Paper text:
Although neutralizing antibodies are elicited against other parts of the spike protein, the receptor-binding domain (RBD) is the dominant target of the neutralizing antibody response. We isolated a panel of neutralizing anti-receptor-binding domain (RBD) antibodies elicited upon natural infection and vaccination and showed that they recognize an immunogenic patch on the internal surface of the core RBD, which faces inwards and is hidden in the “down” state. We observed a continuum of partially overlapping antibody epitopes from lower to upper part of the inner face of the RBD and some antibodies extend towards the receptor-binding motif. Class 4 anti-RBD antibodies mainly recognize a patch of the molecular surface conserved between SARS-CoV-2 and SARS-CoV.
Numbering used by the authors:
A (entry chain R): 334 to 527
B (entry chain A): 1 to 52, 52A, 53 to 82, 82A, 82B, 82C, 83 to 100, 100A, ...
C (entry chain B): 1 to 213
Write the structure that this text describes.
Amino acid sequence: NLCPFGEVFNATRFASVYAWNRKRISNCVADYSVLYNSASFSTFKCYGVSPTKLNDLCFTNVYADSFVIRGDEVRQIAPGQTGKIADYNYKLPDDFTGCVIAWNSNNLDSKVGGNYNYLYRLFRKSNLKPFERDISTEIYQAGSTPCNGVEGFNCYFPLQSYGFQPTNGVGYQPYRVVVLSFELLHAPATVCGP
Amino acid sequence: QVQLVQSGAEVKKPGESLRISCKGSGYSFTNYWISWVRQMPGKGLEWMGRIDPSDSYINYSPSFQGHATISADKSISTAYLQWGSLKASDTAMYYCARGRNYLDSRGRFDYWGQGTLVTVSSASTKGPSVFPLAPSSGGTAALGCLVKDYFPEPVTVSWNSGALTSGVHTFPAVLQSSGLYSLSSVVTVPSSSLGTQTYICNVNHKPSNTKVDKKVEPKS
Amino acid sequence: DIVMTQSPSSLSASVGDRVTITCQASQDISNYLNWYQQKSGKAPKLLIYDASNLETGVPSRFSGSGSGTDFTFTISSLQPEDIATYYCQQYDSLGFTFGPGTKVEIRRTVAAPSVFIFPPSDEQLKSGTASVVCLLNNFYPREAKVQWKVDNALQSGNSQESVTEQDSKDSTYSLSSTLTLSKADYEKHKVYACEVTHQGLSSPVTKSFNRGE
């Protein structure tokens, strides 16, 4: 049984980063060569393992997280990063073990009028913990004036839309991101290579 | 203008350590992968590896196991290639190159450093002695400079401080049986100018800090 | 584990000829292939990226085509400054693999060398050794024979040659031959001569001097 990476990587729709998607990979064999043999990825970084040594390993509790962000935010999807995405949307632990894969998705995620369907969290009282997911939509008190759960001056709805237009600069174009989480333990492993 | 500037030629004994450098300018150093490329004496180009200066993420070529290590210093827009213990087989030319922007998946080297020549040898550094190659005394006369008994490569030779380039031929060095290099540089000039004009070869051998300006004259 | 090949390993063509060289990959690499030019004494230079895209500022006589496992690079009208080694280069999301290179040389009309001979300098003689130098200037093709005859005695094993890279403007070569002799050996003879044969010389050419002006 081949692991269903195609349905993660080639899913027609991707989640907004604030509501990032996660799928468990279990009881299957994985050929990662199909990933690194292509030149479709603008980011392909592995932590705690080398990408060309992935097929030689067995893993426990494999996870594949996926979402869309802006091109110039992809560096935040790494251990030890900060910024709007790493702080408020999707946070990797300093001790992350896995791979971060990204590619430009302007052709699929941009639109002549502007695609505003992809959202990110703009405001938050504190930084996310690693792998924490926050889908709340309470009004954010950005200033001295109380909000009482009402939108108004200095009282903001916390999610904002990316504006993806096809003629944006590359750094402002949408990128699809897949984060593969691994654990390499002295324990049984249901995910192995060829 | 995008520029990559590498450190100078190096000669080391086997077992010594060495770090060579590559400083980027004219662009955002932390947004592009830097690659190192080796060219063995007479051989082609070999890709060694590449580093992302923003996080020092490194992809190594499968060939290079763990001999040479790539690194980068964000604060001074500089990338490095280093050896803890050099071997004879590290004798080569090394190029750094700017590759793709982190946003770009299309790899290509659009700008290159000038190359750093590394010599690993136990033989001693020796500056050259420079001897004139004096004209006959046709219409055209040849004169030159013999740059003899030096180690290691390279030497540079110019004429009249670089002002004289037309007709200049600087030959590739030949390794003599003594293990020392020798090189000639010649220039053809009008015979009518030998009496009155000044022809000087500027020889520079940086490994020995030897610089020589030799006036070449017709023999009395 | 991608093996890149190129053919031919070297070639010769005349100015204005159309030149086509090939590159093969051991597996399908789509159009993820680049082409570089490396002149003697220079860093390589990117010419074509992604199989067919002309780099900015690169002359339009260069082009590339192909995809999958076979690629071509074409100079539509070979120019004197085009002498170099041309490399293909595969890439993927992790790194690169260069092809082995194709060396391009230029064919031109035969040109005989102009020959010059230089006695050793007094400065070098004082140091105990004598270098006699013979210069063959601006000839084509590269094959040339130099024979040292001292008092009409053919020399052997006491000389070394060096040849320039082909000139980027007139496509000729130059060659220096150095006869090394101890000072005592140099004084044993009187007539130092360098005899040159070359395809452009119907008869051998000799340049000589007499030890002591």
